Amino acid sequence: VNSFSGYLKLTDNVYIKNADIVEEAKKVKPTVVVNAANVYLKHGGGVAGALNKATNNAMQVESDDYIATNGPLKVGGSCVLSGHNLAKHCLHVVGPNVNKGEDIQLLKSAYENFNQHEVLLAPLLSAGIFGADPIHSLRVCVDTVRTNVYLAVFDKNLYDKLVSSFL
């Protein structure tokens, strides 16, 4: 038993809700919140900008030190950093950005990072400003992640569409 509420159960291990991940994170305090990161951990907009804003820019400060030490992530890769006031940990995961020409097949590799964590609150990778089809992203999620994932979908219209078209 865990503390997530009002989720719809999609599969054995995937759940979905219409929620603001920032507000869900601050209420739940999950062990892991996933950020829709880029390779530079520049959290300027989308989910990343919203999560970073909710940390009062502490996420960005920590991220800049991470990059200065380690260099950029790989597309499809991840790193674990602090969750600040939102979660114990933040798993920064880089899905391919279609608006940058990156290969969509890397979306499966991105979701594989979730399997290193027993339970996660997450957005749909490569959705939103990353330019992928969120329905596709949901299919890859369901077919790749084996751990328990609670998907927060900000847009109510999108949430209805994803549920109604789910196979």
Ligand X SMILES: CC[C@@H](CNc1ncnc2[nH]cnc12)NC(=O)CCC1CCCCC1
Q: How far apart are CA 161 and CA 49, in angstroms?
A: 25
Instruction: Considering the complex, state which of residue 22 and residue 73 has its C-beta at the smaller distance from ligand X.
Output: 22
With beta carbons less than 8 A apart as the criterion, state whether 13 and 149 touch: yes
126's torsion region: left (phi>0), alpha (psi -120 to 50) or beta? left
User: Among the candidate windows 16-24, 67-75, 83-91, 113-121, which touches ligand X by CB under 6 A?
Assistant: 16-24
Nearest in space to 23 (alpha carbons), one of 92, 89, 85? 85
User: Among the candidate windows 3-11, 42-50, 73-81, 109-117, which touches ligand X by CB under 6 A?
Assistant: 42-50
Does 79 bind ligand X (CB under 6 A)? Our answer is no
Where are the alpha helices (H) located in the chain, listed in sequence order? Answer: 21-28, 46-54, 58-70, 106-112, 134-144, 156-164
Q: How far apart are CA 132 and CA 119, in angstroms?
A: 24
The residue from 16, 25, 50, 94 that contacts ligand X (CB under 6 A) is 50
Q: Rounded to the nearest whole angstrom, what is the least distance from the CB of residue 125 to ligand X in the complex?
A: 9
User: Among the candidate windows 44-52, 81-89, 101-109, 110-118, which touches ligand X by CB under 6 A?
Assistant: 44-52
The residue from 32, 81, 120, 127 that contacts ligand X (CB under 6 A) is 127
Q: Rounded to the nearest whole angstrom, what is the least distance from the CB of residue 71 to ligand X in the complex?
A: 26
Q: Which residues bind ligand X (CB under 6 A)?
A: 20-22, 46-47, 50, 123-124, 127-128, 134, 152, 154-155, 158
